[PDB]
Amino acid sequence: TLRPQYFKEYIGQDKVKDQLKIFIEAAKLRDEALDHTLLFGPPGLGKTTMAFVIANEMGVNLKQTSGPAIEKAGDLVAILNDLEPGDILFIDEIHRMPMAVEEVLYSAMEDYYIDIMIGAGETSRSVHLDLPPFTLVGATTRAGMLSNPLRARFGINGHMEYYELPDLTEIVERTSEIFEMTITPEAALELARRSRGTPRIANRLLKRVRDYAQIMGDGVIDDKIADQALTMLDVDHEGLDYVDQKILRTMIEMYGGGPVGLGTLSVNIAEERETVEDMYEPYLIQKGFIMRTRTGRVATAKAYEHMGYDYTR
Amino acid sequence: TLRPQYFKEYIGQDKVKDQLKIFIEAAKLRDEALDHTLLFGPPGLGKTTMAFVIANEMGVNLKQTSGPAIEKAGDLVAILNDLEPGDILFIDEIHRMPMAVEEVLYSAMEDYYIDIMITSRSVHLDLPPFTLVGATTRAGMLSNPLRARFGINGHMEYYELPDLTEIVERTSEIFEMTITPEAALELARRSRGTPRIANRLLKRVRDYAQIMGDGVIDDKIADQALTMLDVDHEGLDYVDQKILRTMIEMYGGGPVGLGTLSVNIAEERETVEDMYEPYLIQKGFIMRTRTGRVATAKAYEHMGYDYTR
Amino acid sequence: TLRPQYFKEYIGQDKVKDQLKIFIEAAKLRDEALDHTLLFGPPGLGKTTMAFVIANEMGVNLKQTSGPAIEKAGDLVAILNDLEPGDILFIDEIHRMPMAVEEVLYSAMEDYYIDIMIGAGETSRSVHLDLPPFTLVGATTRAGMLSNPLRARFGINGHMEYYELPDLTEIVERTSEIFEMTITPEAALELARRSRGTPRIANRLLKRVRDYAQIMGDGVIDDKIADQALTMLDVDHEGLDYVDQKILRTMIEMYGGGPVGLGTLSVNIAEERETVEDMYEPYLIQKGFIMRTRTGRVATAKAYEHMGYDYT
Amino acid sequence: TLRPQYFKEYIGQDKVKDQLKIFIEAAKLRDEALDHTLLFGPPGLGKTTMAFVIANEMGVNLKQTSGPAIEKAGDLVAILNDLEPGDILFIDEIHRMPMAVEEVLYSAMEDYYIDIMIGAGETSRSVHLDLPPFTLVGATTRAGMLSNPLRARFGINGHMEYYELPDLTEIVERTSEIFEMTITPEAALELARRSRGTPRIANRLLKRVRDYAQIMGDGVIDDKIADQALTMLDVDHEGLDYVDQKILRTMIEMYGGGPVGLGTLSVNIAEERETVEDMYEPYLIQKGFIMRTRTGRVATAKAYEHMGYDYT
Amino acid sequence: TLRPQYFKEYIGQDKVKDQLKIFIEAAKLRDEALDHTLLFGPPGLGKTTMAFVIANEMGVNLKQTSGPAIEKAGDLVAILNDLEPGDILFIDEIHRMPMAVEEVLYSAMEDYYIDIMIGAGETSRSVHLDLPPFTLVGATTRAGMLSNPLRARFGINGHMEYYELPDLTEIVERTSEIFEMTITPEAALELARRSRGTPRIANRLLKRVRDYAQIMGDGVIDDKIADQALTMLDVDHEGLDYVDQKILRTMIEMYGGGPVGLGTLSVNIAEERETVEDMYEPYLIQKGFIMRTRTGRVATAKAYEHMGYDYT
Amino acid sequence: TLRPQYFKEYIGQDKVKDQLKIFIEAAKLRDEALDHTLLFGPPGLGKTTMAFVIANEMGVNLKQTSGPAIEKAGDLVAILNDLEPGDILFIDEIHRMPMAVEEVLYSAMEDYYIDIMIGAGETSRSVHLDLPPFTLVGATTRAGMLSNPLRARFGINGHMEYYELPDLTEIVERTSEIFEMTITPEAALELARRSRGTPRIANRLLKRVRDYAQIMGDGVIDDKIADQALTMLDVDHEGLDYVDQKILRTMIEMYGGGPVGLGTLSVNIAEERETVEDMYEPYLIQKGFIMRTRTGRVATAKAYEHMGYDYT
Amino acid sequence: DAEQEAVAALVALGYKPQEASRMVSKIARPDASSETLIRDALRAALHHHH
Amino acid sequence: SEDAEQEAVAALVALGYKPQEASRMVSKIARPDASSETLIRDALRAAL
DNA sequence: GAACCTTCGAGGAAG
DNA sequence: CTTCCTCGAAGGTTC
Ligand SMILES: Nc1ncnc2c1ncn2[C@@H]1O[C@H](COP(=O)(O)OP(=O)(O)O)[C@@H](O)[C@H]1O
Ligand SMILES: [Mg+2]
Ligand SMILES: [Mg+2]
Ligand SMILES: [Mg+2]
């Protein structure tokens, strides 16, 4: 499989990976389960993959479900009864759980029991269900919309981060070894530099180069073939698409850097307002090529020096 | 028929057409299904046409649906249950699907399985290898997790004069109407770079030659027909010419505000901005400025006035 | 009736009327339906009237509805599939349809079919629904509000224009014969020149003169009765209303022609800022009495020689 | 009752009354419904009262509703279904209706029909609802908010004007007789000069003076009681309130008459920027106390003598 | 109970009482109801109490509700059908009533009848209700948030102002007599100055000082005890609240005295805009702690010397 | 103890705790119920714990529910009917209950009875229910969100606030004994400083340091070990979290300290803009690291020297 | 008459007429007042907890 | 057994299950002597 | 340099 | 969740 399976194999994320190891080892030094854990980060950094590694390293079985699939208290309680001592329950998109079920989880996490009240008046009674020890692991992309009483129960937090060239290269090397293709280390570096720090992008580029290398070449990925393949595709050495280059060129040549409004820029490149703001503008901001101002977008000196145009304040 | 059936018939789009040929050949050589493809770009450039060509080149039976029709998960689940190995599912206007349905697609695209709850009950499906092809005009309206799963992105571009000339002649032979090479060129210049617009002009000119002529399109009939439609040799409409004239003769080229200019021509503000200005800006006849918009030197030469900076 | 029924009776609109004649005749020789048509332009110029004329000249039945009535896809899907070969579907105020409903027309207009989801539960299935040849006709004042993919599908575009004095005079005379009133040719011209170029306004003035002539007169309209009636309505020989005259007078007597701001002018006439800019200012600019500049409104020479002052 | 019931009791608005009489008499001779009419202008001048007078003169029943009460097209269709031949429908604050419902009246006013979708939803189709002859009367404070296609359909327009002192005095006298109070002609003229030309204000002051004149007066509104009572109510002999006086006084004592800017002056009086510009300044300009200039606004000589300062 | 019940018990508000006495008495000679009255001003000054006094002097029953409690037109109809001749309806927070409902009050107030549509579909029908005479009393914390169509229909207006030292002292002495308690004149005068000129605050503090004097004293309130008790609470020497201190300490430290807009300040102090604008700002401005400027509010020299900072 | 029963056992909150003691015993001397009390402040400070202590000190059985648990007026009336003389009812998030409840709660709190009206027209009756004396205790996270007329009924206000360093060290020490962890006074003070005032954070940090010290050390939390453990957790010596340093670090390196807007900032770091202005900015501004200039956020000198960057 | 009065009062408190009838119908006391019935119909339906 | 049968059915209803489906779920359990905890545990377990 | 006028651009609460 | 619209900033002219 592509997904790593153990900390020995899981590349990167040394910060979160280093912390979890100490907590897991301390839990094993006692007859206790791991504290409830919550994972944060942007889309595509391994949040799903890390859950499996934690279970394998704990020497426990993994239960898996998703937030939207749970709608009545019995769903969660029924799943919770399946958990054996120390089992790990992984809930994806935990922020989408309905309040009707969210409110049931508090006594489970803190006391390991549920106390179902029933009846009315003189018939009012309750039943107490003991739950075996367990560890809830949650993953979310929009942490800010969780409720405060839930966030107060998680004892361990993990922030995922973008991978870096010295390690993102190893993912290409390893992935190129699952297919039956030899790749030069210098070629893998050229692919990593353009993957925006995201594993899915690195894999997508590698698949596209593989097709070219075996139809327009000898079925081997050398530095020479990589340059041709990356020339058929629009992706620049900084990872900018054809349209990304066209945006920067337009602002500098026609508006002298701005400020320029979103609507005025859209009609010049012939694109929708929603497309420029959501597809192309986000990466240009993170890379530091443009800034947003109350008067419109404006290009920074960092953008001038990359396009190769003279700059003056 | 009007829609090309194979890449040998598909004129233009050399960039997108070249990439799709490489990826289609490689997939066949490995006996695998093609990756998921997203087609996006301006209206009328060929997105829907290319989706059928891909299926014909792959040699598969195409399933067709549309985003506005899928209202609930039960609709899409029934469609997915009918897919067989290698089938292609094409969803047009994919941007309309409710996000409650897109979340069901996140896993089906990666792991090829569905394990969902749907009088309520559970449902499980195992999906054979299949290729999803999406076409949209509002690509930015799709969620970031969905766009990240498409393996091929095709961005459509406008056509050049040689490509449009060849297209006009091809369509003329389907109507079995005779047209000369230089007559076809005069229609291409006026088609604004869009194949659908070029076909529309040809249909209108044909109707004239059948009623006011001998049923043959020539350099003489074309000039008369185009004068009746009142379309300039740059493709400017009557209203487009009225805008540039008003700016040069009443405001000395500007700057002028959108509100002032609209009232002066008796047009609605929203119509000027959304229907006439976009082409004038892309061709370089008008520029937007912090204080308004001004007519460029290109507009002066086209209208026949002496420019003064 | 008050609406013309054939091109023989439809006065004016030479540009639009001439084009439709050629396209209608060509469609008949090929024995096929007419292409889709969009009619747009200012209010009261004859858009709705032309839609019925097209149906009569084509010799087919006309099905009619309106944009505001179609609120969900179920409504439009039901109107479709009730069409017969060669039918004409006319939608008025087409700019009001929801965008989620417009996108259903994309397949229908280009390929004459639509995709439908049918049944329920395990019986849910998709099916193609195939439509016979038909012609869609749309009329709107706000063409810029329609989506670009929809406007690109209309094969014929008709932009309406304001009428001229010879055409308006003939329209007044025609309407005067639907009623039972005699009107002198010299008096008919006197109304046409005050109708701002719009057929609906010309008909409204005539109705008001009819009521005066049969109460304060002998039931006949002549230069004497016309001049008197128009004095009661207070419409000058250029078509300026009572408020229009007050605006021009105030600009020439207090500010010496401007420049002056809209707010300063509105407060001095006791009008509100929005009524002046939306009701009265638009016609004064299009007719050349006022000029808009970066510094404010200015009165032109044409206003001075009309109000009787000297353009010093 | 306070509201006049017939054109013989309706004081003022001579321009509007003269026209309505001719159009109502002509409509009767033909035995037809009256054309649609729009009444617009400042608040409290008599628009609602004129609508009831028209109903009595035509001799028909008036149905009544308001713009903001209608929230969806279903409501409007229900109201129109209740109409009977010749009924008058009065819609107050007509500019408050949502645009999506306003566009439904377009066919009803011109052709007396409405397109409506019917059926349970599985099977449905459109049908014409056919309306009887009727007259729509609309009243609005700001006609500029109505769309151009709607304003074009109204056949009679009535623009209301402020009342002059001769006519406004007759209204104060008429009201005193209904309250069974005796008022000296000199006193009626005093209340008129302070009523800003609005009948609603004149009636309110009379009610308060009447209460005061009988509790600590001798039961008669003499010229001396009015002066004392109006001092208690804080109404200047020109109708100015204390806030208006504070503005004028500051301009004379702290700026020598100006010019001064609106922002600077607002701070010196502890008043909100937009309140001064919209609530207080308009009346001061129309009366001639303040004048706007390119460099600010200036207090005229009239404002000096009214306060007693020395003009220079 | 503490609430006064007659004009002889209601201390202060001389300007408002004098007017209400005349109007209420004049309305008693004639056998008719009082005109609709609008009371407005800061919270806690006694405008709800005045509504009870008005009812007792007239000798009628009082019904009480609030704007937010009415959600739909049918709610008001049920309430208005439950009013007897001459009853008084009191509506608090009248500025928050829904616009679709506010339109119904205009008719009931001006014409005493209600036109309503009831039922649905084919059962939709109008109803006409004729109401007995009644008096509406409205209360609002905002003088200018009401619509002009509403404010113009109230016939009596009353602006209520903060109480002066002699008045609050008498109110504290009266309240300390209903409770079984003893207070020296020196202590009552101190507590009054500390009570922000507001009767509700004065009564609330007195209840708390009473508890301290029992547990930490001999059961008698003296200046020596009142000083200690008020210093144990957050009440400052000038009566400033904990919220007041935060505001002043933020303006002087986060903005160097300002200027700063109250809108942006609201979110920095973690206080709701409407509460700080209506409850706190009016007192700080009226007492000279904060001053108005073109850009916003600025802390005066008095504020710096009070908080102990340096007036650099 | 960590879960105290009486005030002598409760750590911190001396101001609130000192006021409650006087009011509690003062109410006992008079043999009457305590006045209604409102608790407010940041979450997790101990509001729910304090409610139990108040019940014990009074000597009454506590009853507990929450605003969201109540859905209709009958729900509250049922609970109130189950009360016994002197009972204390605690409502968490009292501001979240629907207004239909507040309308009944008013007379309940003030009159100790409810009067459910019934009947219409000629029929009108009520049922009057007697209620025993009781004390209501409410807790909220904000003051301004509570209904204005409701907030006036509470006679006692308890402003909770963040703990000081001495209190936190004591809580840390007690918690460590439960875990059987040996911690020196210096280590306990280091954790207290960085817990930024909230016990929940202090408990979380201690658990994590325990796991580290049990493996990377000898199970004894020394100052040398505590400081190393905190750097591994990436917790700054000022209590700044990982994301807090990222915001400051980003402004300095990518924007030279700014100015920069919230929209741009929330896009550079992959976060939801609401989260930043709600969770992270409040603590950074209060501690003087970030300033909210009108143009945008700017890094102060403290941030430059704290992060270790030479100021401009 | 107290039977209908109690049910009408419970309807004002938000109970459905069907449930209010069932609730009041569970109690039986010919001499009970609408008030003492309400104080019983509510106590019988509220879920007490310990 | 009606005590355990009623408790298990009523407790299952408190978890959001319908009265009919709750009856069917509990009706599938054979042992009457087992406690409501075991009845609900097995009832929920069988529906998983 | 104080005061007016026009034009563009980005939020947020009323659907 | 979306469209409208209103609040704010700033370029340019004149005394
Ligand atoms: N003039 C007064 N004399 C005596 N008590 C007063 C006076 N004004 C207000 N109060 C008392 O202070 C409180 C005011 O409450 P209320 O009148 O409801 O304030 P508002 O209606 O302004 O919100 C009541 O306890 C009332 O008895
Ligand atoms: Mg994942
Ligand atoms: Mg297409
Ligand atoms: Mg029409």
Author numbering:
A (entry chain D): 19 to 331
B (entry chain C): 19 to 136, 141 to 331
C (entry chain B), D (entry chain A), E (entry chain F), F (entry chain E): 19 to 330
G (entry chain H): 158 to 207
H (entry chain G): 156 to 203
From the article:
The central and universal element in genetic recombination as well as in double strand break repair and in the process of replication fork rescue is a four-way DNA heteroduplex called the Holliday junction. In prokaryotes, the two proteins RuvA and RuvB play critical roles in the processing of the Holliday junction by promoting the ATP-dependent unidirectional strand-exchange reaction known as active branch migration. In bacteria, the Holliday junction is processed by two homo-hexameric AAA+ ATPase RuvB motors, which assemble together with the RuvA–Holliday junction complex to energize the strand-exchange reaction. We show that RuvB motors rotate together with the DNA substrate, which, together with a progressing nucleotide cycle, forms the mechanistic basis for DNA recombination by continuous branch migration.
The remaining seven RuvB motors can be grouped according to the number of bound RuvAD3, with one map lacking RuvAD3 (s0−A), two maps containing one RuvAD3 (s0 and s1) and four maps showing two bound RuvAD3 domains (s2, s3, s4 and s5), together suggesting a dynamic interplay between RuvAD3 and the RuvB motors. We found that cluster [A], which is positioned at the top of the staircase, contains either ATPγS (s1 and s2), ADP + Mg2+ (s3) or ADP (s4 and s5), a configuration that is consistent with a progressing ATP hydrolysis reaction at this pocket. At the opposing lower side of the hexamer, cluster [D] contains either ADP (s1), fragmented and interrupted densities (s2 to s4) or ATPγS (s5). Subsequently, (s4→s5) cis-Arg218 of sensor 2 moves away from its own binding pocket and demarcates subunit A to be primed to undergo a cluster switch. The acquisition of a new ATP molecule (s4→s5) is then accompanied by a concerted motion of subunits E and F together with the large domain of subunit D (hereafter called ‘converter’: F–E–DL).
